[PDB]
From Swiss-Prot, chain A:
Single GO BP term: protein-containing complex assembly
GO terms of molecular function: gamma-tubulin binding; structural constituent of cytoskeleton
Cell location: Cytoplasm, Cytoskeleton, Microtubule organizing center, Centrosome
GO CC terms in record: centrosome; cytosol; gamma-tubulin complex; gamma-tubulin ring complex; membrane; microtubule; microtubule cytoskeleton; recycling endosome
Species per Swiss-Prot/TrEMBL record: Homo sapiens (Human)
Designated gene of the protein: TUBGCP4
Name of the molecule in the record: Gamma-tubulin complex component 4
Record disease entry: Microcephaly and chorioretinopathy, autosomal recessive, 3: A disorder characterized by congenital microcephaly and chorioretinal dysplasia associated with poor vision and nystagmus. Variable ocular anomalies include microphthalmia, retinal folding, retinal detachment, optic nerve hypoplasia, absence of retinal vessels, round areas of chorioretinal atrophy, and attenuated electroretinogram. Most patients have mild developmental delay and mild learning difficulties.
Domain of life: Eukaryota
S-S bridge residues: none
Tissue: Ubiquitously expressed.
Keywords for the protein's UniProt record, in alphabetical order: Cytoplasm, Cytoskeleton, Intellectual disability, Microtubule, Primary microcephaly
Residues of the full protein shown: 1 to 191 of 667
Family: Belongs to the TUBGCP family.
From Swiss-Prot, chain C:
Record's subcellular location: Cytoplasm, Cytoskeleton, Microtubule organizing center, Centrosome
Name of the featured protein: Gamma-tubulin complex component 3
Coiled-coil spans in chain: none
Complete-protein stretch covered: 304 to 363 of 907
Disulphide-bonded residues: none
Assembly and binders: Component of the gamma-tubulin ring complex (gTuRC) consisting of TUBGCP2, TUBGCP3, TUBGCP4, TUBGCP5 and TUBGCP6 and gamma-tubulin TUBG1 or TUBG2. TUBGCP2, TUBGCP3, TUBGCP4, TUBGCP5 and TUBGCP6 assemble in a 5:5:2:1:1 stoichiometry; each is associated with a gamma-tubulin, thereby arranging 14 gamma-tubulins in a helical manner. Gamma-tubulin at the first position is blocked by TUBGCP3 at the last position, allowing 13 protafilaments to grow into a microtubule.
From Swiss-Prot, chain F:
Subunit structure as annotated in this protein's UniProt entry: Component of the gamma-tubulin ring complex (gTuRC) consisting of TUBGCP2, TUBGCP3, TUBGCP4, TUBGCP5 and TUBGCP6 and gamma-tubulin TUBG1 or TUBG2. TUBGCP2, TUBGCP3, TUBGCP4, TUBGCP5 and TUBGCP6 assemble in a 5:5:2:1:1 stoichiometry; each is associated with a gamma-tubulin, thereby arranging 14 gamma-tubulins in a helical manner. Gamma-tubulin at the first position is blocked by TUBGCP3 at the last position, allowing 13 protafilaments to grow into a microtubule.
Stretch of the intact protein here: 271 to 324 of 1024
Origin superkingdom: Eukaryota
Transmembrane segments: none
Protein name from the UniProt record: Gamma-tubulin complex component 5
Tissue expression pattern: Widely expressed, with highest levels in heart and skeletal muscle and moderate levels in brain.
Gene name of the encoded protein: TUBGCP5
Organism: Homo sapiens (Human)
Protein family according to the UniProt entry: Belongs to the TUBGCP family.
Location in the cell: Cytoplasm, Cytoskeleton, Microtubule organizing center, Centrosome
Chain's role: Component of the gamma-tubulin ring complex (gTuRC) which mediates microtubule nucleation. The gTuRC regulates the minus-end nucleation of alpha-beta tubulin heterodimers that grow into microtubule protafilaments, a critical step in centrosome duplication and spindle formation.
Swiss-Prot record, chain G:
Superkingdom of origin: Eukaryota
Intrachain S-S bonds: none
Compartment(s): Cytoplasm, Cytoskeleton, Microtubule organizing center, Centrosome
Similarity field: Belongs to the TUBGCP family.
Protein's name in the database: Gamma-tubulin complex component 2
Subunit comment: Component of the gamma-tubulin ring complex (gTuRC) consisting of TUBGCP2, TUBGCP3, TUBGCP4, TUBGCP5 and TUBGCP6 and gamma-tubulin TUBG1 or TUBG2. TUBGCP2, TUBGCP3, TUBGCP4, TUBGCP5 and TUBGCP6 assemble in a 5:5:2:1:1 stoichiometry; each is associated with a gamma-tubulin, thereby arranging 14 gamma-tubulins in a helical manner. Gamma-tubulin at the first position is blocked by TUBGCP3 at the last position, allowing 13 protafilaments to grow into a microtubule.
Expression sites (tissue/organ): Ubiquitously expressed.
Disease linkage: Cortical dysplasia, complex, with other brain malformations 15: An autosomal recessive disorder characterized by global developmental delay, variably impaired intellectual development, speech delay, facial dysmorphism, microcephaly, and varying degrees of cortical malformations including pachygyria, thin corpus callosum and subcortical band heterotopia. Most patients have generalized seizures.
Amino acid sequence: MIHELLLALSGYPGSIFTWNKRSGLQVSQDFPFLHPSETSVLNRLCRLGTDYIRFTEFIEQYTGHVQQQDHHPSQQGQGGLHGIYLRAFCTGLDSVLQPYRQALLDLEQEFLGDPHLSISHVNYFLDQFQLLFPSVMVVVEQIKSQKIHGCQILETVYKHSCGGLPPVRSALEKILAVCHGVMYKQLSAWM
Amino acid sequence: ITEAALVRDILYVFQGIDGKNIKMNNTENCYKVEGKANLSRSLRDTAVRLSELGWLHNKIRRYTDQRSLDRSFGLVGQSFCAALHQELREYYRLLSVLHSQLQLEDDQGVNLGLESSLT
Amino acid sequence: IRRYTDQRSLDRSFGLVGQSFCAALHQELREYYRLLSVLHSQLQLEDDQGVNLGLESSLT
Amino acid sequence: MATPDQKSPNVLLQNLCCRILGRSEADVAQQFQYAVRVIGSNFAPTVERDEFLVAEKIKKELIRQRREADAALFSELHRKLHSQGVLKNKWSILYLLLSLSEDPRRQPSKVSSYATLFAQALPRDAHST
Amino acid sequence: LWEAALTYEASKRRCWERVGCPPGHREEPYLTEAGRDAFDKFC
Amino acid sequence: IRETLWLLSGVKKLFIFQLIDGKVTVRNNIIVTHLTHSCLRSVLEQIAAYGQVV
Amino acid sequence: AGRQSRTFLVDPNLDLSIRELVHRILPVAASYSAVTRFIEEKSSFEYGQVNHALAAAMRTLVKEHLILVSQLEQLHRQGLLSLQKLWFYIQPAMRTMDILASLATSVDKGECLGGSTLSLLHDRSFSYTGDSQAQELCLYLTKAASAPYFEVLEKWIYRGIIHDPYSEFMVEEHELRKERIQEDYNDKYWDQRYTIVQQQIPSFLQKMADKILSTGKYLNVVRECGHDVTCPVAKEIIYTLKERAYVEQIEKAFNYASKVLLDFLM
Amino acid sequence: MASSSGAGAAAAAAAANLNAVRETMDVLLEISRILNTGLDMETLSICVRLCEQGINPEALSSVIKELRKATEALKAAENMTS
């Protein structure tokens, strides 16, 4: 069951964990082998997993798809995520999700090591990402909704980088560092 | 009603989740044990004692989740929420250990009346 | 003995020396009650085991 | 190719003395004799075979050393140990380890006071051993 | 003897098809690749 | 895993992943002990898409 | 009913001997309930740090009691617990809980606060002079309870700063208008800056109270003189029953402050 | 909102399955009536389950026809002996 849960968390929805385009990742049904309270807790973790899946979908939407060659590259950034800043945003998001992927693999290995471990151990171990991911998802959704383009995206990230969540602060600092690297590269080219 | 079912309910309450036989009574703003006759009055009182802690846990977690999203709470508010989340993580770690111990006890299939049984 | 201990435990006017004497008496009484409890447990073990174990624990 | 088997106390004590003193059994004969004399008349009917008391004591000690994280790790380790069915006398092993435990703080280099409390444990003496 | 037996190392290989004894079980290669003796048996 | 590596190694005519009209398709009757049929199918579908590209 | 000990109803169809044994044992549980009530009431921050510390120590002892009860539960689960074994094992625990409950009831009846609480603790410790187990318990309680009081004392004697949220220290500060302290014939600076709280004087410190007062007065004068005084003799004050080592340390601090003040004045 | 997704989805799926089964049974009943098969709901459900379990339709049909003939012969014998 843990392997299936991780696969859903790894982006492979199954018969237990159903993905809904509208609702995101959800537990598909009541399983006879789970206590309903255990089902409730698992779905509570599945909320974080759903956010992760939606983040991965966004990553594919903005970096995984070929940029339509609309002659005016400035407007490609509006409707579709496009622009070097958009690529930097996607790269930063993937870099921030890399530690989560590593933690998920470590959890899988640990659960493989000890058959007496329960899902509660994962819920403990994964709670840090259950707190981290929602804020970054909100920031990304704001970027998408405001159609931030070019360096104006950098300004928005800076404004969001001043958040109060220390882990969110560090993650946004990493993203801002990548964006500033892109900005500095452009500035280098100009100067 | 077996004690093990009460253990499961208590683990859910520690997670703020209603058990099969213990449910949150919103009218009493407390988790209530379902009125199934087979609960000992002593067992009922013990369940109530644990359910007060579960109610407090769920209330705290609800507050943290409700306020963590409010950017207007400012940096200090976010820091308070973060500290609360860290303490909640420690609590959840302890709860996970207890749950894993109960699961191991179920998994071994042996009724070891050893002092390690979750009483 | 227990009546004496109860009679003197309530008298604050007995002073510290009196209280200490009562405390020593209570400690010895606790030892006696422990011994009595052990003997009771042995007799109870003999009754509960159903076996006429001629062990020193059988309640004769 | 060693199969676990009950070996006489003399062999175990000899190996223990050899490793503790780091000398041949001939060089620890006096110490071996003293240990043998003390050990040879000591059966613990008074020890209560209850792991929970030992675990609680270990937790309290860890808290005293400001090692709450280590206490949690110890709890998890105890859970894993219970999961494994290798040891039968866990109460004895835990009691021995706690008695032989040395405080890393005694981290630091000493421990604040030794106001031993009545808390303690059970006496088991109640049974007719 | 338990401690002499203690000095035994065991395989770290695990699988999610096995949970009761994860001491490894040697996937046992197949199609050539089991070496000369298996190839001779195949021949 | 081995069959996946062989597919990724560019082997044609795999048993689990069948090539139909130049599209790598997973055989429908495959199940693994540790995965749900739908989850395994999804993961294998992603792998198969990359294999089809290859 | 009210601030009474909890009473128990025993089924009338129970054995008379069993009923009498129960009536003999039940007092420990009544003490436990009373102690829990006291802990829950005095646990409010409003009751001051001394009462908070008392409640915390009581909580620790309650935890130990719960551990004991759990061990008895384990024995019962083994079926190894007889009523006589229970009585034997609980007798020391019964006495400990009864002593604790009597102390709690005395503190609650006296509304003891700060130095009065410390005095009550000292007197109770003398009342248990003959009970080594009770004496050890009282010593633990006194050592714990002195921590906030000795911290406040340390702050006053080493820095002349009253950080007393609950007005527990034996010295009380009155706001004297400094403008008139030089002008007004009344020693408002000398008399009102530091005042003795007679009720807050710890019985164990009563013999040194005047020296403590003078020490804190001198330190306050030095601070008001603009001389920053780092007390080199600032040490942790620990409650001790046989040795008045804290008294000697206080005397050393008084002498140091006196010397510093004298040098400042000269 | 997180915890609710498994049981709620399970309930919605069960309701949809029940409605689909009802629709299928109605279609099957209409087909049987148009073909004058003489099958009742319970017998039709049993036949459907057997076909889903892989029973050969020719064997199943022959068995059903033989059982009906046997039931008619038994009813005729019971009516002649009564």
